[PDB]
Amino acid sequence: TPELALDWRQSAEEVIVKLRVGVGPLQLEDVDAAFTDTDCVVRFAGGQQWGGVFYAEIKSSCAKVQTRKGSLLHLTLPKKVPMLTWPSLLVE
Structure with a gap:
């Protein structure tokens, strides 16, 4: 979790996204994540x-x-697809 930006990772085990909120107050809405059997959304309180x-x-x-x-x-x-090469970090 860098003080320069944001820490995320994908590994054979897990997709990690850690985001720092400077959007004023931290409210429960501050991650809006939509996950479907065939897709996913990660949302920050702002536009991240x-x-x-x-x-x-x-x-x-x-x-x-x-x-x-x-x-x-x-x-x-x-793990979404382990040992498999994704088109992008985030593919949406």
Whole structure:
């Protein structure tokens, strides 16, 4: 979680997005994440919104957790497609 920008990761295990909120007050709305059996949306309280797109399956990856508490917005995303090369970090 850098003090320069934002920390995210994708690994064979999980998609992590940690976003720092400078959008004034932190409200529960501060991540709007839409996850479908074939797609995903990550939304920041402002305009920092990311996602992914799948053709199939993902309702296990529809399982998502996000942390808010301060300056950190954290999505724990179960593995979408492990060892498979994605078109982009966020594909939406």
